[PDB]
Structures are given as C-alpha cells and as structure tokens.
C-alpha cells in the first residue's frame, strides 16, 4: 500500500530520468568535440586539395561569407574579419613543457639521420603589442645509436608560431641550413607534420610526424 | 653591431624583401603602427591631424604610407651618404617642434623589429637593424 | 510525507533538467552532420571534375554515364539509374520565389565599389511543363552602398534561369542597360541555402567581383 | 572553518557512494554480458524459411502462396502485376516483388554435386545475369540473359561457358534458365530463392529438355 | 547517530592529517641524508688524496689498487674489484644533454668583470663504443653580464669531454679565438648535479675565475 505505491513512484521516477538523460546523450554525442575536430581535419584535408582562396600572404576568415585578411593583422587583438575568425584562432598549441615526439617519414639531410625526433617546449614569451607571433625556446632532442657510437643531442633553438598560418617555425641551431617547421592541421593541434627544409634552396629534404606526447 | 657599408648592404637587401612589393605594404605599414600604439597609447595624441585614433581610417593609411615612403628613401640611400644625411635633415625638419619623447622613437623601434621578421619570415639580422635605426633615428631627432 | 518528499524534489530536478535540454537544442541545429558530408563531396566532387563534356550531365557519383543537361529533370528516366529525374538533383527550392540570398559582394574590376551588401531576391519562377529541363526565374537584385558618406541603395530588375544539372542561376539585368552587371550563382555547397556567385557582364562572362549569398532570409 | 570541512564530508563520500555503485554496476553488467548473445537475424531468417519450406503449402501448379496470416494461393501470372490479387495483397508486397535476384551483375556461386553429364568432382559453378528486361504490360516476370560458368583447375586453361536465356518468377521466387538461341541444348537451370532473402538460393544444373537433374549447388550471391 | 557522528569527526581529522603530512613532503626532500654522506666521502676522500700517480684510477676507498684512466669505464673489468666498471663511477649523467648547469662566476685574473651567472649547457654527446673510457661532450657556454647599466648575454659554443675516472668536465671553446676562456668542472660534490669549475686559459691551465654550478636546470 503506503509501500508499493511509493515504490512505484519510484520506478517511474527512475524511468523518466533514464528517457531524458537518453536525450542529454543524443545531443552529447551530436556536438562531441572530438568529432566535430575529425570533421575539421576532413574539411582541412579538402581546403588543402582545392585553390587558395586568398592571396598569398593573407587569411581566409571562413564562414558563409568569405574574407580575406593580412596574415599579419591574424591574432593582434583587433578584429578585422567581419565575422572575428582573425581574433578566435588565438590558442597556442605549445605550452613551456609541452613534449611532441616525431616519426620519420623521409629524411635524406638531417646530421644523425634519427628514428624520431623529440622537440620540448623550454618557455613562450608573447610580446603584449604584437600577440600574434608568440616567441619559443625549444630544444630539438635527438638520440641515435650506431654501431661506431652512441650519439644523444639537446639543441636549444628559437621558434616562432604563426596563428595565421597555423605553424610553428624552428630556426637551425646548427650549422646547417638545416630549419624545421610544424604545420598543423587546424584543427587537431596534438600532431603536426615537422617538415626540414633548407633555409635557402627552400629544398624540402626530410619529413617527421609528431604528436603531443 | 654597429652599421659598417656592409651591415648597411644587409639592411638594405632585407629592407627590399620586406617593402618593394606593393600588396600588404599599407597592411606592414599598419601592422608597424598598432604595436607602436598599443606600445605607448598616448602617443595617439600627436597624430589627430592624421586620424591616430582609428588606423583603418584612409587618412591615417595615408599617413603610415607616407611614412614608410620616407623610411625607404633613409633606407635606399644607407650606401649613398650625401643623400641619407639630405633625407635625414628633411626628416628631422618635418619632426621638429613635435615633442616627441625617446620613448616613442622606442616604441617604433621595437614595432618595426617585431613586424619584420613576421614579413620576412626567414632569413633577417635583428641587430643590424637595431644599428641602422638607431642611425636613422638618430639623423631625425637631431 | 516520508520520502515522497524527496521524490518530489527529484520531480523538480528532472524538470529543471528538461528545460535545460530543450534549451539545448537551438545549439544543437547549428551542427547539421548530413548536410556537412553533403558539401565535403560537392567540393570534392568539384576538385575531381568529369569525363562529361561541356553541356553534359554525369549520371551517378561515381558511375560513368553521362546524358544531355537538357534531359535533366524533364521528367524522363534517362540515366541507367536515373539519377537526372532524382529528388535531390530536381529540388527547386534554390529559386523558390520569396528567399532572399544575402552575402558581401567583393570587386576587383570593372567598378570600384569598396566590400558591400548585395541581395538576390527571388520574385517568380515559370517551369513549362513542356519543358522542365529549366526553371525560368525572375528577380531582384538589391546592393546597399555606402557611396558618399551616407548610405544609398542601387537596385535592379532582373530575369534569367536556374538549370539543375549544373545547378546554376544566371540572372541577367532587365532592359538594364544602365551598367548593371549580371549575376551568376552556384548551389555548389551541397543544399539549397549557400551559393557562390560572381557579377559578371553577361557577353563575355567575364568575372568583376566575387560575392558568396547565404538564404538567411527575412528582410 | 569547521562547517565547511563537514560539508565537503558529506559530498566527498557521497561521490564515493556513488564511485562504489558504479562499480558493482560494472560487475553485474560484465555477468550479464558472460550470458551468451542474441542471434543473427539472418540465422533466424533462414530457420524460419527452412521450417516454412518443410511446412509446405497447398497450392497447386502454376499457384504460390500469397503468405501471411490466412493462407491464400493465386496465379504465377498475377504477382507483382500492378493489381492486388491477395485478400491481403502480399502479391504486391515490395519485399516479395523484389527485382534484385535477377539484377544485372547477379552472380550466384557454389559448389556442385554432380550425378551425371559432368564426371569431373565437386567444383565450383556460377551463373551471372548479364541481361534483363521487364515488359510494363507483362510485369510477373523478369525476363534475363545469363551465364552458366564452372571453376576449373589452373591446368585446364579450356574453360566451359554456356549461354542462357529465362526468366525470374516473384510468386515462384524462382530463376529458370535455359540455352540461349541457337546454342546446342546442353545445359539449364533452375534456382529457387528460398532462404528467405534475395541472396541465396538451391540450384539444379539440368538438361533443358527433361529438366534431369545432372548436379545441385547450394549458389549464394557474391 | 549515535558516536557515528564523532567517528566521523574523527574521519575528517585523519584527512587533515593526510593533507598535511603530503604537504611536509616537500620539505622532507630537502633532506638527502645519502647524498650527504656521499658528499662528505667525497670531500675527505679529497684530503687524503691517493698514491696513485697522475692519470691513474684508486679502485676501492680503502682498496691499494691502480689502473690506468684510460680503462675506466671503457666496458672491461680491470680493478680486482671491479670498481672501475661501477654504476656510480660510470654515471653519464653529469654530462647528459639537455643539463643546464648555473652559478656564479667570480674573477679574480684575465677579465675585470664582477660577480655574475654563468651557465654550462650541455648540447650533445657522443661516446665511441670502441673507446667508451671517455665521453665527447658539446655545450653552450652564457654568461649574464650587467656591464654597462644594462644587461647583456656573452655566449660561445664549446667542446670537450668528459672523464669518468678523475669526474672532469673540460670545455674548450669551439674556434673562439675570440677571448672566451675554457671551462673545467669537476663533480666532486658526491652527485651528477653540482661541480666546482674554473675559468682557464686552455694551453696553462692557469685559473682566472672559481665557479661553482648546480644543475636547477629549466631556463
Ligand atoms: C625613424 C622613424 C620615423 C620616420 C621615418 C618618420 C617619418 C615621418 C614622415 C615621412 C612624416 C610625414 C611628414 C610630412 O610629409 O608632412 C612624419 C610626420 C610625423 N611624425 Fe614621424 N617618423 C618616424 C618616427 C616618429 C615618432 C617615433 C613619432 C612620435 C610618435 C613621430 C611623430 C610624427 C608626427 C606627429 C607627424 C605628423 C603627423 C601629421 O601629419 O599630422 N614620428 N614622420
Ligand atoms: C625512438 O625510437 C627508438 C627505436 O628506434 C625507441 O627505442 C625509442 O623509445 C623512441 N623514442 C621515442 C620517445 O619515441
Ligand atoms: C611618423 N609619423
Ligand atoms: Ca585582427
Ligand atoms: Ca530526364
Ligand atoms: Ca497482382
Ligand atoms: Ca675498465
Ligand atoms: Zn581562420
Ligand atoms: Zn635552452
């Protein structure tokens, strides 16, 4: 009596909770941001099959009413496209401590010739009157073993990131024209591609793929 | 460093790769001019002839054009003394009576090292360039 | 009241819950899975281009047959699959008389008009039932313009067609001679809502400006 | 304070009430799970289909069952005609009027049991719809061009291949096949989609006059 | 609830107590009772000096027997103890890359600058599996000078090595003819993070600065 109907009370209680947290999952799963991120990364890798959309040292704001913008007004705290694309990009991808280890692709250029590649994030200094090019120490890590020896490196270098283009620019240490660049995705910022270029033929010679480790 | 004729070359062939191409130039030339202001805010004051007070506006586009017109007239003539020092002279007369503060010549100092090397990119040398501003800027304040 | 009590605060949580969920939902429409997917294979689709010649119609996505963009939508099966009589391809909702595409109009010949607004509205359609290859449309074609430090709208009649198998509006200015540039408009981004359209002078189609319309729509 | 850290008490071990129900929750749920599963449907569907077959029906030549709830019996000529014949009209079902088993590409493929004509051992046989044509005044059948073709080992490299023409029949669920015109009357043969799905069916590799069963295989649509 | 309630109280205690032990951990690390004693071993190991020659290995503490310096570590066993081939005689991580080892540099000939920091960064290694009694160190070597009014960094590329068997850093700087003195480090402080250096002049050996660094280590 005063027991079973309250524990059916209960039970219907239970039920409709069930129901609507079955909703709450429907909208969860629908703006998971993990898979609005893929969905970024796909429409990233068909911008990359289609012509630029902007001149080539500009910014496309995106949306249903494109724009294009100085790479060099990207990310100063202005806004100058008219729907802000310029002034929401503004996470850096590096924090001081940040690890990313990358696998070899190709590489016919680089000194040691390594298996992977660590690059640490040693600090981040952003100039308040000009954010949009935030300034790293980092130090490029690399470890390869021979048969003649055993050879671990740690070179500290300067590193610039450009929010415009999504892209971290490391410039040599060494005496190579030896310099590495990250380009991101835009979207995932936990893998970029580390491509070394030569600073002066513009050659492209080795490719790693790094990932936030 | 100190501007040697070749550190002054050097300037001047980064100067090239920087300016003389005239797309994003009104772009550099504002680019120079929000991190001055956003350096030292005050300074907006000196520039209401000139719409200091929104960069975007056409007046003041002019403006920072017509600055980097005379910038690149001190920069192409590095190597040609008799020149630079004219151009220095004209520069200095056009700035006198302003009350313009080391400060502010600072300000723009570190706006023009920070939007160059974003133009460039690559391959720039921050201190012959902070020798040959100082040149510069120097010749204008007196 | 023992603990019915309790329930009834339960009662009141789930109500607070379901408000908060239907709140939810405007945030939930602007994501549109399908219709993302819809765009990724126009684009892509537009990257890969077709064996089909010009004034042709391929027939499925991948298939290789192709037929005579005046057989597309007529109301005969001519694909093997029949694909140019399919729903999606015959949608004629692009030129559905009272939408209002809007979008900014972008120069870089022909006139020397700074960014500005410019609206295509659609005002009426005939489709011949003799002909249904083609919906002829008739519209409107509004730009404010901030000329003289106030602002001032130019607007002109227009008239043209909107053909499916290319998916395109062309609207050219009516008895216009008086330097209006016709329109030219794309539903390449998979719906019925967005297009990418060019001004263009309609003897040459040569491009003068970019302008990119969104439905939007309502004044 | 004092009240605070009595409160936090209270939260922090009603989290870990929670934390522990979760857990047996887990529990309870991995013992479920070690119950076995459900069962394919279509393992379902075929054993349905296997029983209704052996349950037959009491139709006669040139009738199949309608299907359903009340059993009714109609003409071969009367499915998928365009007017319900069925008391329940499954005679225009769009399951039972299916087109696929006779689709240009179907290919169904198994291995033959022979009992005469061929002496070679159990092999492969396919048959492949190559064409079709369903005349709109006439729609209860699908009339087809296919192909009667045999796996033979790397060594042979003289494969046999036979030409036929036939039709499918929705009320029969049945593929009949025989030779193309002017082909030497060698072989036919009948398929009966029986599985309860357009992509299995019992074939019998027949002569075309006698219908003489010379070998059967269980063809599965690949 | 009977004395549940005071349990409970009781309950809350232990948890302040758990938090503030953890807290105590921090100071408790400052504490290397070990490390110490290895310190002090070290020092006194110092003052009573060995009978061993000039590049010679003392085996043991107390242990009579010498080897050459150029078997220590090197991947045989030549002490009758086996002391040379030691975990902690053939430690490589004083000279680990990445390291950045800083303190202060006081003069005291060569260069008239007052006290200031000094940093050794060790850039890289290589050690020959043919020849591993010692390890090929590169590194970076700064120094912040407040010379006039304001700050500015001297900094110079160096190479050198490092000798397991006497634990010595040596850093001569990489085609510097530029006056940037060489750095030698000796880790006789019992651990791979603090070594007493020297500012010297390559070819005497002459000290123009003492210096002592300790890793901290992260810029
Ligand atoms: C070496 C860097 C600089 C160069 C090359 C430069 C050059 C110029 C030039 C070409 C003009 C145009 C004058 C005319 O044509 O009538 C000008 C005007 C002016 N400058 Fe500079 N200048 C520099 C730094 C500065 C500094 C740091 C300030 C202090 C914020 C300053 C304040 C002004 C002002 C207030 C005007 C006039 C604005 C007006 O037209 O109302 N300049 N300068
Ligand atoms: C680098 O690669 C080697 C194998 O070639 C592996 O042993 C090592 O762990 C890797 N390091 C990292 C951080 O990936
Ligand atoms: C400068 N003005
Ligand atoms: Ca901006
Ligand atoms: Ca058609
Ligand atoms: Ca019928
Ligand atoms: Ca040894
Ligand atoms: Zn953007
Ligand atoms: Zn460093």
Redesign the interface.
Known sequence: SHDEEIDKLNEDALKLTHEIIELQEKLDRRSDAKRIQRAGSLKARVEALEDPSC?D??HQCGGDDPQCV????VC???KDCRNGDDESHCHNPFHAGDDFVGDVVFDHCTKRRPENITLSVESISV????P??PKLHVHVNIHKETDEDEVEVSLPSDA?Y?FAEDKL?VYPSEDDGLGLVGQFDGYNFDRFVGDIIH??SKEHCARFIFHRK | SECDVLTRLKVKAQWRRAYSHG??RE??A??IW???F??VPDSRTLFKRVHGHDTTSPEFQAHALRVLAGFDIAISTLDQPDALKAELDHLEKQHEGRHIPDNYFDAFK??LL??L???L???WDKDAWSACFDHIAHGIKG | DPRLAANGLRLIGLERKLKALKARLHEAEKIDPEGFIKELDARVSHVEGTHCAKKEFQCGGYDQECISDLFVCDGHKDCHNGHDEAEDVCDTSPVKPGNIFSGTSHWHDCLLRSDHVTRVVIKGTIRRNYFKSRIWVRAQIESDLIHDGKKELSDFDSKGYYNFANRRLVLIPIAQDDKHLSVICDFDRGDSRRASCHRVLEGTLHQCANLSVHLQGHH | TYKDRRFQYILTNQHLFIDKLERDLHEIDDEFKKLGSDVKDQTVRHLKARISNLEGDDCKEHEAPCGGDVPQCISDLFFCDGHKDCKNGRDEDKEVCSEVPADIGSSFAGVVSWQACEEATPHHAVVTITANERKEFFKPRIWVRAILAFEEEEHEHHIKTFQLRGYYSFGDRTLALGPERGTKPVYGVRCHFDRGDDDHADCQIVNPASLFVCGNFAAERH
């Open positions: 001149p040292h500009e100085s790479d060099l007004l100063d705290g202005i100039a308040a009157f000009f949009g090019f610039i450009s620019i600073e002066a | 797309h994003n772009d550099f504002q680019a929000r991190a001055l956003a350096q570190t706006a920070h939007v090397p974003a133009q990119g690559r391959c």
